[PDB]
Structure 1
Amino acid sequence: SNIAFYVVSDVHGYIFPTDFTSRNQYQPMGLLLANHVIEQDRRQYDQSFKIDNGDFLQGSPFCNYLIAHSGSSQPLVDFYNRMAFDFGTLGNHEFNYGLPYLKDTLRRLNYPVLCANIYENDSTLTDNGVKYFQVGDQTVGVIGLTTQFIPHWEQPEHIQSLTFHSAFEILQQYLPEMKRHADIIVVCYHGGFEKDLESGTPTEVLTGENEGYAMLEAFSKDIDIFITGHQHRQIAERFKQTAVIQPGTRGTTVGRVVLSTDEYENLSVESCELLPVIDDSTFTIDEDDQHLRKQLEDWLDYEITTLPYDMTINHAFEARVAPHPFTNFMNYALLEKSDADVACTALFDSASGFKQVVTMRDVINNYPFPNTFKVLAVSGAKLKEAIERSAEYFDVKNDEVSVSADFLEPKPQHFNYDIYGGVSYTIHVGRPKGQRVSNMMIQGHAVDLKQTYTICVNNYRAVGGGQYDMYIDAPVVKDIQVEGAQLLIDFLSNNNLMRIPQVVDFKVEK
């Protein structure tokens, strides 16, 4: 006899088969299609379970649409609810819209969300962290865990009553009890691997954000299935006898782990793989769902303004190695809103800049996170530390400036590179990290390392996101409670002539 476990992770509100780059876009992705793949495939097994492993409440323009309309997650919850999932876990982005929004979401879902390591006051935020069920005369035990690193990213007001414990420590403490109750153990961790599974070599700085390797290294023999996410990587292999899965993101793949009995009726791992999400001739989207997609596209097509010139980004890297009218524009909007000496923003992966006609679609693609902003008081020396962190983004390949391996592997982190406004500088990539920034000037004057300056950063950066630890606890001069997309919309609506001064002025070379 057998049992199959299907998992999607980091769906990120990509339900329809589109990434929204254009209205009629259609691509083999999204939860509708990924679920269709599960439904067809699962029928061959004696029984099966369906799991969402986090980062389901935020991510796509559909999520923006929901906040902007009823403020309710119900339309999204309805999709999950129809599909008859068995359980899920919490990802960090589940907190992006506040704790009440999350709590309301959990009570609207028709299956439990398991999180054993996030406490609210003196108990788990979620009703439970562990679930047990029978497979024949055996018992399966499931424990849900979430990356402890949330304080380094989220709005303080969204997590103020919460306590985040190490996933490794909570697992370590629960194992003994789980093994007393169950024969098969399944860990669903919304987090990834900090070391390469085969070599054990660190693949990122060991901050505790990701504890998957330490968990396997210490407890593999007692774990049958190790479900992971967060890093958006595609993994399906064995760690000793443990089946290890990471099913990417946006429903382009589905993780499937099959367990089957041997003589003695003992369940063992039969297979562990990623199933490709593909279109087929039986897949259909019902009328109501297509009506919702249309409303969504209609909203995305809403015209914000018409600019007198183009600010498109042809090649992302070009808009990172040197000033670009669009980065100049973003920084200028932040300087004008905040009145700080300096501002900064990352160029996000979907940021293609603006054409002359700007729609809601374009604004969201250029600022896809619900970040607010903060003006921080920092010494000129702390400012330099922040520019040196960004300068780590570059490396030299051949005799050309390129992107550092550190920011591409195991997966891309371009969003951790910032472009600054109000301060001019020179980055020398051939010099050691931490001493690459030269010629710093703020308004005709050299940056005095001992003087106090102000910088507008997003809330993610304010709590240290992307290893910008120098901003933590910097005095808050201004708390700007306007999210990025709206801040750009406001600026666009108030400055018709769009005469933008040059606030981004920097150079990158060896």
Structure 2
Amino acid sequence: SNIAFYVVSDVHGYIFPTDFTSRNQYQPMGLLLANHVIEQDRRQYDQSFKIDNGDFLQGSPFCNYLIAHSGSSQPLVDFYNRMAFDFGTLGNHEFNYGLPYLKDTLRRLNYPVLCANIYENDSTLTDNGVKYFQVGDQTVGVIGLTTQFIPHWEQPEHIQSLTFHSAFEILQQYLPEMKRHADIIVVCYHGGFEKDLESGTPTEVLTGENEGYAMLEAFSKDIDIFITGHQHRQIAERFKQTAVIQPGTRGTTVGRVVLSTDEYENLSVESCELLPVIDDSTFTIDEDDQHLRKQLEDWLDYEITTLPYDMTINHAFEARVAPHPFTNFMNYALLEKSDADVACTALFDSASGFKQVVTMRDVINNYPFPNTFKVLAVSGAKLKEAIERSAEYFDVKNDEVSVSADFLEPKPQHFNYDIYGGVSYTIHVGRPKGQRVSNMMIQGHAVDLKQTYTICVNNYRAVGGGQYDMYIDAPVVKDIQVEGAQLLIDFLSNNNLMRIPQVVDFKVEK
């Protein structure tokens, strides 16, 4: 006898088979197609469960569209509700629009979301943290856990009443009970691994963001299935006897773990792997779904404005290693809105700059996060520290400047490299981290390390996101409650002639 567990994670609102780079795109991804793979595959097993492991409420242009129209998650929830999931977990992105929007969403889902380590006042935010069920005369126990690092990323107003506890500690505290109650333990953690599964060597700074390895080295013998996410990696292997799974992102793959009984009648892991999501001749999309997609594409094709000249980004790396007209433009927009001495922004992975005709699609692709902004008062010394952190993005390989492995593995984080405007500087990649920034000047004046300056950063940075801890608790000079996308749209609307002065002036070399 057997049971299959199917898991999707970090779907990020990618429901349709497209990443929205162009209107007619179709590619083997998204929840509709991932779910079709599961429905076809599950028929071979005696029984099966379907699980979503977090980061489902934000990410894609579809989510941007919902916020800009109904303001409700119902159209997204509808897709999830017709698929008959058994349970899910909370990812960090479920808090991006505030606690009331999340609570409303959980009420509308027709399955439970399990989170044992996030508390609201004196009890768990979600109704439950653990769930048990039977498979023959055996009991399965499932515990849902989420990365504790949320306060380093989210707007304070969105999480003020919450308490985030270590996933390792809550698991440890629940194991005794779960071991008494169940024969099989499933842990669903919206977090990943801070050390390599085989070597055990750290693969990132041990901040507590990711605790999966610690959880496995300490409790593997009692954990039968370890479902993970957050890092967007594709992992399907065994840690000792534990089946470990991480099924990527955007419905590109589906995780499947199968358990089967012995003659003794005890359940044991039979297989653990990732199933690829592929197109096939039986897959169809309902007419109502196709109609929703059309509304979405028409909205993305909405023309914002026409520019006199082009500002396309051909090679993203080239626009990070030296000033580019598009990064100069975004920084100028921030300096004009904020009135700060300095401003900064990352060049996101999906940014392609602007062409002469700018549509809603291009705007979203250049700034696809719902970040607002803050002007912080920082000393000249703290500013240098911030530039030094960004300079860690580079490394020297084969005698030339390249992107550091730290910022590419195990997950790309181009969003953690900032390009600064209002300040000129030199980065010397061949020098030790922490002492790579030179020639800092602000308006024909060397940066006085003891003088106070103002810098406009996004809210993610303001709370230390991306290891920019020098901004935590800096005095807030101004809270700009306008998201990045709209801030650009407003700028385009008011600056017809697009006479943009040069505010980005820096260079990167050995």
Q: Shorter-chain TM-score: what band?
A: over 0.9
Cα displacement (A) at 1:246 = 0.1
- How is 1:122-271 mapped onto 2 (pairs within 5 angstroms)? 122-271=122-271
Quote the Cα distance in structure 2 between the aligned partners of 1:405 and 1:371: 26
CA distance in 2, matches of 1:338, 1:414: 24
Structure 2 Cα separation of the partners of residues 26 and 141 of structure 1: 39
Q: Distance in 2 between matches of 1:199 and 1:432?
A: 27
Deviations 1:192-232 (A, max 9, x none): 00000000000000000000000000000000000000000
Structure 2: 5+ residue stretches without partners? none
SS in 2 for 1:433: coil
C-alpha distance after superposition, 1:114-168 (max 9, x if no partner):
0000000000000000000000000000000000000000010000000000000
Question: Residues 462-483 of structure 1: CA distance to partner in whole angstroms, max 9, x if unpaired?
Answer: 0000000000000000000000
TM-score with structure 2 length normalisation?
A: 1.00
Q: CA deviation at 1:267?
A: 0.1
State the Cα distance separating 1:58 from its structure 2 match.
0.0
Give the Cα separation in 1 of the matches to 2:151 and 2:349. Answer: 23
Q: Distance in 1 between matches of 2:400 and 2:300?
A: 39
Note the alpha carbon deviations across 1:417-474, whole angstroms, 9 max, x for none: 0000000000000000000000000000000000000000000000000000000000
User: Structure 1: how far apart are the matches of 2:347 and 2:382?
Assistant: 22
CA distance in 1, matches of 2:408, 2:230: 16
1:411 positional shift: 1.8
In structure 2, C-alpha distance between the alignment counterparts of 1:411 and 1:189, rounded to whole Å: 17
Residue 412 of structure 1: CA displacement?
Answer: 1.1
Give the drift of 1:337.
0.1
Q: CA deviation at 1:94?
A: 0.2
- In 2: Cα distance, 1:61 partner to 1:499 partner: 30
User: When the two structures are aligned, how many residues end up with a matched partner?
Assistant: 510
SS at match of 1:250: coil
Counterpart CA distance in 2 for 1:181 and 1:426 is 61
Alpha-carbon distance between aligned partners in 2 of 1:410 and 1:76, rounded to the nearest angstrom:
29
Supply the distance in 2 between the matched residues of 1:124 and 1:244 (Cα, whole angstroms): 26
How far the C-alpha of 1:39 sits from its partner, in A, is 0.2
1:13-34 deviation line (CA, Å, top 9, x unaligned):
0000000000000000000000
SS for the counterpart of 1:485 is helix
State how far apart, in whole Å, the 2-side matches of 1:312 and 1:341 are.
27
* C-alpha separation in 2, matches of 1:316 and 1:268: 47
Give the Cα separation in 2 of the matches to 1:413 and 1:64. 21
Mean Cα displacement is larger for which, 4-13 or 401-410?
401-410
| Counterpart residue number, 1:448 | 448
What is the rounded CA distance, in whole Å, between the counterparts of 1:461 and 1:3 in structure 2? 44
Distance of 1:263 and 1:353 partners within structure 2: 62
Name the CA distance, whole Å, in 2 between partners of 1:307 and 1:125.
Answer: 47
Q: How many Å separate the matches in 1 of 2:383 and 2:476? A: 15
Structure 1 residue 413, shift from structure 2 partner = 1.0
Alignment of 1:72-471 (within 5 A): 72-471=72-471
Q: Which whole-Å CA distance do the structure 2 matches of 1:37 and 1:227 have between them?
A: 19
Cα-to-partner distance string for 1:71-105 (whole Å, 9 max, x where unaligned):
00000000000000000000000000010000000
Secondary structure of the 2:244 match is strand
For residues 186 and 5 of structure 2, the distance between their equivalents in structure 1, rounded to whole angstroms, comes to 10
Q: Give the C-alpha shift of residue 398 in structure 1.
A: 1.2
Paired residue secondary structure (1:456): strand
Aligned to 2:39: 39
| C-alpha separation in 1, matches of 2:484 and 2:156 | 17
* CA distance in structure 1 between the partners assigned to 2:50 and 2:109 by the alignment: 14
Question: Identical aligned pairs, as a percentage?
Answer: 100
Give me the whole-angstrom Cα distance separating, in 1, the residues matched to 2:127 and 2:507.
53
Gap regions ≥5 residues in structure 1: none
- The alpha carbon displacement at 1:322 in A equals 0.1
Instruction: Look up the SS of the partner of 1:90 in the other structure.
Output: coil
1:334 CA drift (Å)? 0.2
Deviation at 1:365, TM superposition (A): 0.3
In 2, Cα distance between equivalents of 1:165 and 1:46: 37
TM-score, scaled to structure 1: 1.00
The Cα of 1:361 is off from its aligned counterpart by 0.3
Structure 1 position 262, deviation (Å)? 0.5
Q: How far off is 1:374 after superposition?
A: 0.2
- CA offsets 1:214-259 (integer angstroms, 9 cap, x no match): 0000000000000000000000000000000000000000000000
Q: Distance in 1 between matches of 2:198 and 2:406?
A: 19
Superposed displacement of residue 410, structure 1:
1.3
| In structure 1, C-alpha distance between the alignment counterparts of 2:55 and 2:406, rounded to whole Å | 24
How far does residue 399 in structure 1 lie from its aligned partner after superposition?
A: 1.4
Q: What is the Cα deviation at residue 50 of structure 1?
A: 0.1
SS at 2:23's partner residue? coil
Once residues 486 and 206 of structure 2 are traced to their aligned partners in structure 1, the CA distance between those partners, rounded to angstroms, is 36
CA separation in 2, counterparts of 1:160 and 1:360? 33
Query: CA separation in 2, counterparts of 1:156 and 1:382?
Result: 22
Q: Secondary structure at the match of 1:203?
A: coil
Partner SS for 2:270? strand
Q: Take 1:347 and 1:222, find their aligned partners in 2: how far apart are those partners?
A: 44
2:79 and 2:140 mapped to 1: Cα distance? 27
- Tell me how far apart the structure 1 counterparts of residues 414 and 333 of structure 2 sit (CA, whole Å): 21
Following superposition, the deviation at residue 349 of structure 1 comes to: 0.6
Kindly report structure 1 stretches of 4+ aligned residues shifted beyond 3 Å. Answer: none
Distance in 2 between residues matched to 1:403 and 1:350, nearest whole Å: 17
**How far has the Cα of 1:409 moved from its partner?**
1.1
1:139 counterpart SS class: strand
